[PDB]
Amino acid sequence: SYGFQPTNGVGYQPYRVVVLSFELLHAPATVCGPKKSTNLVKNKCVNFN
Amino acid sequence: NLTTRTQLPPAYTNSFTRGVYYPDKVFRSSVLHS
Ligand SMILES: *[C@@H]1O[C@H](CO)[C@@H](O)[C@H](O)[C@H]1NC(C)=O
């Protein structure tokens, strides 16, 4: 058990940790960043994302 | 309960060229990949 007391020092205080794990270069992605979506063009040298 | 359905020693079979899966989800055409 953990004795998390308000009088304890920083070393013995509660600390909440969230570890986010994601894998790139994989199957079709589902969770994506908040970016827009420009229309699609063809037969024209263009940058793509 | 349902123990001892029957009594027989297991047999063995040649798997041949079986059990090969796709290593990754990347399309590859007309290539040899190690
Ligand atoms: C045989 O009977 C029960 C019936 O519910 C079964 O689920 C269970 O696997 C067996 N019980 C034993 C082996 O004690």
Swiss-Prot record, chain A:
Annotated consequence of substituting N8T: Reduced host ACE2-binding affinity in vitro
Disordered: annotated segments: 26-48
Outcome following mutation: N8Y: Increased binding affinity to human ACE2
Highest taxon above the source species: Viruses
Function: Attaches the virion to the cell membrane by interacting with host receptor, initiating the infection. The major receptor is host ACE2. When S2/S2' has been cleaved, binding to the receptor triggers direct fusion at the cell membrane. When S2/S2' has not been cleaved, binding to the receptor results in internalization of the virus by endocytosis using host TFRC and GRM2 and leading to fusion of the virion membrane with the host endosomal membrane. Alternatively, may use NRP1/NRP2 and integrin as entry receptors.
Quaternary structure and partners: Binds to host ACE2. RBD also interacts with the N-linked glycan on 'Asn-90' of ACE2. Cleavage of S generates a polybasic C-terminal sequence on S1 that binds to host Neuropilin-1 (NRP1) and Neuropilin-2 (NRP2) receptors. Interacts with host integrin alpha-5/beta-1 (ITGA5:ITGB1) and with ACE2 in complex with integrin alpha-5/beta-1 (ITGA5:ITGB1). May interact via cytoplasmic c-terminus with M protein. May interact (via N-terminus) with host bilirubin and biliverdin, thereby preventing antibody binding to the SARS-CoV-2 spike NTD via an allosteric mechanism.
Protein name from the UniProt record: Spike protein S1
Organism: Severe acute respiratory syndrome coronavirus 2
Covered residues, full protein: 494 to 542 of 1273
